[PDB]
Every structure is written in C-alpha cells, then in structure tokens.
Symmetry: C3
C-alpha cells in the first residue's frame, strides 16, 4: 500500500504554518523593538518559528517528502523537511534555555551535539528501508537522554547558581520541554518507525507537539524578558 | 517537452569557469603576497571565485542539475548547483563590503541570514513542481529587500561613520551590487519560475550576472586594498 | 554490469563499526574523566570515531549508497556516506595535530578548507557519470598537497617553535597521517574513479585505512595526553 497524507493532515500543515508565521512576525516586532545588547532570546526564538514556518509551508505545499519502503511492504511518505527543521530548531530551543544558566560553552557544545545526533539518527532511521531503523532509533533515544541529563544536571546547577528569577524560568521551561519532547520518539515509533499510524495522524501529532514546543514555548520565552 | 541546456549554454559554463578559475589563481597570488593581518578581503574574494569555479565546472561537466516538472507540463533541468554556490558566495560577497563598515556582528548576522533565506527559498521554489513556487519566490524577494535595507541603512551608517575612503568604496560596491543583484530574481521568474526562457538563455543570463557579480566585483575589491 | 558489495565487505563494515564504536565509548570515558580545560583532544578524537561509527553502521545497514553509472558502462554503488564522514572527520583529524602547534587560526582555516575541498571534489567525482570525474580527482589531489604543505611547513614551524614533547608527537602523528592518507586517492582511483576493483575490495581497503587513520591514530592521540 502507499501511505500518504490526507486532507486533515494538509489543513494541519496550513494551520501550523499560520501559527508559526504569525509568531515569527510578532517576535520580529518584539525583538527589533529591544536594544541590540538585549536581543539574544529574541533572535533565537524568532529563528525557531521562522524556520518552522518555512518547513510547514514546504510540507503544506507538497514538498519535503519522499516515499520510502517500510519493511512491512508499504511505501510511506517520510517528511524529511521536519528533520531539517529540527536540525536547526531543537539546538535553538535548547540554547534559548541554556543561555539562562551561564554554564561553560564546552558543556553547551556537547548538549547541542547530543541533540543534533538525536535528530540525524532519527532521519537516518526514517530513510532506512529495513530493520536497522531500530538501531538508529534506540541510539537516538540514548542521545535524547544525554540532552535531558545536560538540562537537569549541569544546566540546572548553572541556573540555581545564578539564582533570582532564573531557576523558576529555567525549571519551568526545561520541565515543560523535557516532558513535551517525549512525544516525538513516541510518534516516530508509531509513524516513520513502524508505519502503524496514518501519515495524517503523524502530521497532526507532530504539528500539535510543534505548536506546544515552538508557539506556546516561544510565547512564554518572549513574554518573560 | 524536456527543456535542457544547448551548446551555447555549455560554452558559457566553460567560459565562466575559465574566468572564475583564472580569477581564483590571481587572487590566491595577491592574497598570500599580503601579510597575515591584511588578508581578510583576499581570503573572502578568493573563496567567492573558487566556489563559483567549482560550481561552473560541475555544471559544464553535466552535474548539479535535476529534471523537475513545471506546472506548465514541461520537464526543466534545475541547476541546484548554482544555489549551493550562492549559499556560500552571496554571504561572502556581502561580508566583503560589510567588513568595510565596522557595524556590530549582530547586525551583520541578520543581513547574512536574510541572504541565506533568500537563496534557500529560491532553491525550494525551483525544486517545487506546483504553483506554491511563487510563495517561495515572493518571500525570497522580501528577504532580498531586507538585505538591501541592511546595506543602505545600518551598513551605510557604519561606512559614513568611519569616513575616509570607506564611503566611496562601500557605496560604489554596494550600489553596483544592489542594482546588479536585481537581475537574479528577474532571470529566475523567466527561467526556474515560469519556464519561459530556454535553459541556454537562463545559463547565459546567470553567467553574465555571475561574471559581473564575482569577476568584475572581485577584481574591484582586490584592486582597492 | 551492477557492481555492489559482497559479504566480505559487509562484515568489514560491521568489524569497522565495532572498532569505531568501542573506541568512541572508551574515549568518552577518558574525556569526561579529564577536567573541562583539558578536554580538547578528547572531544575531537571522540567526535572522529563517533561519526565514523555512525557512517559504518549506516553502510553496514545498506544505507549511504547510490548506484551511479561509470563511463565503462557498469553501475557502481557509490558510498556517499563515507564522504559525509570525511567532511567532518578529516578536518577533525587535522585539528587534533594542528592544535599542538599554536599556529594562527588564519593558517589553520585554509588548511581545513583545502581539506574540505579535497573531500567535496572527491564526492563530486564519485557522483559524476562521465570523464570529468578525473578533473575533480586531479584538483582534489592538488588540495591534498595543500594540506600536506600546511602540515609540513607552517604547522611544522609552530611545533618546532613550541618545542618540548610537541615536535616528537606532531611529526610522529603528521608523518603517519601524511603517508597513510595517500591510500585514499589510490583506492579512489581504483574504485569510484575507474571501477577497476570490486566494491568489496573498495570497502575493505577504505576500512583498513579508516582503522589506521582513526582507531590506531586516535588511540595514539588519546594515550599521549
Ligand atoms: C546545515 C547542514 C549542516 C545540515 C542540514 C542539511 C541536511 C539535513 C539535508 C541536506 C540535503 C537533504 C537531503 C537531500 C535529498 C534527499 C532525497 C530524498 O529521497 C530523501 C531525503 C534527502 C536525502 C534529504 C534529507 C535531508 C538533507 C540531508
Ligand atoms: C553548508 C550547508 C549547511 C548547506 C549547503 C548544502 C545544501 C544547500 C545542498 C546539500 C544537498 C543538496 C541536495 C541533494 C540532492 C538533491 C537531488 C536533486 O533531485 C535535487 C537537488 C537536491 C535536493 C540537492 C539540493 C542542494 C542541497 C540541499
Ligand atoms: C555539514 C554540511 C555543511 C555538509 C554535509 C552534508 C553533505 C555533504 C550531504 C548532504 C546531503 C547529501 C546528498 C543527499 C542525497 C544524495 C542522493 C544520492 O543519489 C547521491 C548522494 C547525495 C547527493 C548526497 C551526498 C552527500 C550530501 C551532499
Ligand atoms: C518493532 C518495534 C520494536 C523496536 C524496539 C527498539 C526500541 C529501543 C529503545 C531504546 C531505549 C533507550 C536506550 C537508552 C539507555 C541509556 C543509554 C545511555 O547511556 O544514555 C544515558 C546517559 O548517556 C546519560 O548520561
Ligand atoms: C505567473 C507569475 C506571477 C507570480 C507573481 C508573484 C511575484 C511576487 C513578488 C513579490 C514582491 C515582493 C514583496 C516584498 C514586499 C516587502 C516586504 C517586507 O517587509 O520587506 C521589506 C522590509 O523587510 C525591509 O525592512
Ligand atoms: C584513466 C585514469 C587516468 C586519469 C589521470 C588523472 C590523474 C591526475 C592526477 C593529479 C596529479 C596531482 C596534481 C597536483 C600538482 C600540484 C598542484 C599545486 O599547486 O599544489 C601544490 C601546492 O598547492 C602546494 O603549496
Ligand atoms: C534561514 C533559512 C534556513 C531554512 C531551513 C529550513 C529548512 C526547512 C525545510 C526544508 C524544505 C525542503 C523543501 C523542498 C521543496 C522541494 C519539494
Ligand atoms: C484519520 C484521522 C485521525 C486523526 C488523528 C488526530 C490525532 C491528533 C493527535 C494530536 O493532535 O495530538 C496533539 C498533542 O501532541 C499536543 O500536545
Ligand atoms: C570549499 C569547498 C566548498 C565547495 C562548495 C561548492 C558547491 C558548488 C556546486 C555543487 C556541485 C554539485 C556537483 C555534483 C556532481 C554530481 C552530478
Ligand atoms: C538560444 C539563444 C538565446 C541566447 C540568449 C542569450 C541571452 C544573453 C543574456 C546576457 O548575456 O545577459 C548578460 C547580463 O546579465 C550581464 O549583466
Ligand atoms: C553528530 C552527528 C553528525 C553525524 C554525521 C554522520 C554522517 C555519516 C553518514 C551518513 C549516513 C547516511 C545514512 C542514510 C541512511 C539512508 C539509507
Ligand atoms: C573479493 C576479495 C578481495 C578481497 C580484497 C581484500 C583487500 C584488503 C586490502 C586491505 O585490507 O588493505 C588494508 C590497508 O589499507 C591498511 O593500511
Ligand atoms: C520543534 C521541534 C521539536 C522540539 C522536535 C523535537 C524532536 C525530538 C525530541 C525528536 C526525537 C527523536 C528521538 C528521541 C528518537 C527517534 C527520532 C526522533 C528524532 C523523532
Ligand atoms: C554570485 C552570485 C550572486 C551574486 C547571486 C545572487 C542571487 C540573488 C540575489 C538571488 C535572488 C533570488 C530572489 C530575490 C528571489 C527568487 C530566487 C532568486 C534566488 C534567484
Ligand atoms: C578517516 C578518514 C580519512 C583520514 C579519509 C581521508 C581521505 C582522503 C585523504 C581522501 C582523499 C582524496 C583525494 C586526494 C582525491 C580523490 C578523492 C579522495 C577524496 C578519496
């Protein structure tokens, strides 16, 4: 069988595009308002939703996908565009909260590299036509746990060391992030991995997560400067 | 119909390759002549024409293209190689003149990111098989205007603030750049966009522009240190 | 004919994967042992064998390759994955020894860029379906010689200037590196270039070289801190 997106998925792509694009314009206003030395979280958060807006437009316009054979015998549309999005946006999301903590660049570096490895191995698993897809998935899950360790140990120490409003903002955003980001490997296991849920279900599920992880998250970042 | 390059286009690729490659060797001599602390514009300008030489060789040797369906029903050879070129060379061209101005890195950053977005969205539009090609094009045109705003407002302020020979060199190069770079979205509208002009006409038109934007421009940069 | 890997090549991929992966875990232990300010060669060497482990897994799992027409009339499986590996790992290998020398960043920059050009032009040659493959190869060989010049002239001067244990370590590693890295364009000439040796012979030959260039080399780096 050929498993591709339905109407419900395409509308979710357009809805999600609109949310990201609106957020991008808003955050551009809010950022270029602020003085040059105060723009860091602005630039980062703007870049997150701008890149996601570009990816969502692409997917809504029937780009950024390729039909890939799953070992169950179906051809499934793999939205490689989402991984390109995540390659830039997930390190940016992490930096948005890591920058609160003042930890050394050396520590931040291995957290973001654990994150890019996570995404890249997911991509490779998604483009695999065979059972070795699951080795990619499992090692990527290990790297996700490296990222979480980074957030809840050295990152957390940094935030508590700074004190003031930093711990509340950091633990609030990091706790939300940590819990939310578990949605992604779950959806992947069900979608690109096992070809169990429909591509519409996949698209809608990743869209909901992306709205939570970028729109909700981003507005929270932007509204607490 | 299948729209591909003719002989006139391939010779223009070889001619343009020769011009870039000659310029690269010359600029390598001129740069490694100069002392380590004086090499910046040298390295940048060398990199521009070296990368363009590699891209032009590739296209002359029948690489860097894929046949893509245009909604008019023709298959058109899209030279994705040129966009890979532009991804590196257009930020480098901008840096070549932005470095004259001493503006903050924060400003330079959003100018180059506006530029990379411009190129990338052009690529996506070029690889699109449907009418959403024009949304890519229009937003990319907006980003081009962001780049020009960067050059003619903060960049321009920086140059005038420095004074001396900087304003004359900056406004001369930036004015030439600004006007010349309008050629690209015009050609694209006629070529990758609408499939209106032949691929030979496309190749020749982008070649002429590239010779002006890199060979002429580069020699002007290199001959005013 | 269709030239693809046999069993001997796939086992060599798994063996090589195991060696890289073991080395990655070991080097992770050794690096996160050391204090934050002493981790540079650790991080670099860890990254080398981690990336190679990912590439070798991919190739062992039948990814990272595409069938490409050689002008001799055969279709040959080109392992583009190896070039993606080399794009990151060969600059990292160079930095691992260049960091001993204290030379200016400006010099290190053109050495690594000569190296990335070398790899990229090899990739382009490998993906070429025609005789222009050899122009890519020859220019890439020139860039290899640029890299070696970098190592044996400014890099070497830096090392001798520092003195102490640096010259012995630098010249030992650089001499080994220089000689060993000649294996790659030889194998390429025989494999991706001319389609003369089998893909199994290719895989085994690049694996042997990679084990020498990353496992042996990496253990030597890690065991001389
Ligand atoms: C910023 C840089 C370093 C990384 C971002 C670019 C990466 C993630 C991009 C660049 C080119 C992309 C690939 C180009 C072409 C295809 C063909 C299709 O059948 C499957 C997806 C696949 C294979 C893409 C996957 C994502 C990709 C690998
Ligand atoms: C330096 C990094 C971050 C960016 C530069 C690399 C980008 C622009 C390159 C990497 C791989 C490239 C893609 C790889 C394969 C194909 C297949 C072809 O049918 C259409 C072009 C397309 C899709 C290429 C377009 C350009 C591309 C996306
Ligand atoms: C870190 C960034 C800047 C560079 C690393 C990414 C580059 C080297 C990667 C990104 C996408 C890759 C390409 C994507 C798709 C294909 C299709 C296949 O038929 C031939 C290989 C080819 C064409 C790949 C070659 C390597 C590639 C170009
Ligand atoms: C048919 C479908 C079935 C496929 C099943 C495969 C699923 C595999 C799941 C993987 C579990 C995650 C493994 C990860 C286990 C932890 C590894 C680790 O070292 O990371 C933590 C530290 O680095 C922190 O410092
Ligand atoms: C059949 C072919 C017809 C297709 C027509 C589509 C062409 C669309 C053209 C686009 C016009 C350019 C829109 C750009 C308008 C300006 C947007 C903007 O905000 O940028 C300026 C500021 O950022 C500066 O600070
Ligand atoms: C059928 C197969 C036959 C194909 C033959 C093609 C092989 C071509 C081989 C290339 C030889 C290498 C050329 C390289 C020659 C040196 C060029 C150079 O300037 O580099 C050195 C300096 O930069 C150092 O500072
Ligand atoms: C700043 C610019 C960086 C943009 C990175 C966005 C990459 C997101 C999606 C890839 C879309 C591929 C779109 C490809 C369209 C071809 C079908
Ligand atoms: C065919 C129709 C099946 C429609 C299935 C629709 C499934 C929607 C799942 C969803 O929206 O989850 C959002 C959360 O992840 C937000 O946190
Ligand atoms: C320094 C090295 C960076 C080189 C970047 C040049 C990329 C330019 C053109 C892509 C050519 C693809 C050439 C692909 C040949 C395969 C047909
Ligand atoms: C088939 C033959 C049609 C040949 C069309 C040849 C069209 C050449 C256009 C050109 O060279 O423009 C150069 C400028 O952009 C430089 O600024
Ligand atoms: C840190 C993460 C960077 C990983 C870079 C490793 C790239 C190595 C090999 C490409 C494998 C492509 C694997 C593609 C699998 C699709 C068949
Ligand atoms: C079919 C069987 C042919 C098997 C050919 C096997 C050829 C193995 C060559 C090799 O392992 O070289 C290693 C060195 O490069 C290490 O420095
Ligand atoms: C805006 C997008 C976000 C926050 C995306 C996050 C994605 C992840 C946390 C993905 C994780 C994955 C794994 C842990 C294993 C398998 C592949 C995944 C990439 C989807
Ligand atoms: C050496 C190459 C140069 C200076 C190339 C410049 C290219 C541009 C200014 C391209 C601009 C584009 C748009 C404004 C919209 C549509 C896509 C374009 C990429 C060709
Ligand atoms: C761990 C991997 C290593 C050290 C790979 C090294 C690869 C090279 C030195 C490759 C060189 C090449 C040329 C000089 C010309 C033709 C293409 C090559 C890429 C294989």
């Amino acid at each position: 069988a050929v498993h591709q997106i339905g109407e419900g998925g395409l509308v979710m792509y357009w809805v999600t595009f609109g949310l990201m694009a609106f957020s991008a314009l808003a955050f551009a206003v809010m950022t270029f308002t602020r003085p040059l030395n105060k723009r860091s979280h602005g630039y980062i958060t703007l870049a997150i939703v701008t890149i996601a807006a570009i990816a969502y437009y692409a997917m809504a316009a029937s780009g950024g996908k390729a039909l890939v054979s799953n070992p169950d015998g179906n051809l499934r549309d793999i939205y490689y565009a989402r991984y390109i999005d995540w390659f830039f946006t997930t390190p940016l999301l992490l930096l948005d909260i890591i920058l609160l903590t003042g930890i050394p660049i050396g520590v931040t570096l291995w957290i973001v590299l654990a994150d890019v490895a996570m995404i890249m191995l997911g991509l490779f698993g998604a483009l695999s036509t065979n059972s070795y897809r699951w080795g990619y998935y499992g090692v990527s899950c290990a790297f996700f746990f490296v990222v979480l360790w980074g957030l809840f140990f050295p990152g957390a120490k940094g935030a508590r060391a700074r004190g003031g409003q930093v711990p509340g903002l950091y633990f609030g955003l990091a706790g939300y992030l940590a819990l939310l980001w578990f949605g992604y490997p779950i959806v992947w296991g069900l979608a690109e991995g096992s070809d169990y849920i429909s591509v519409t279900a996949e698209a809608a599920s990743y869209a909901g997560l992306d709205i939570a992880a970028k729109v909700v998250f981003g507005w929270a970042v932007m509204l607490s400067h």
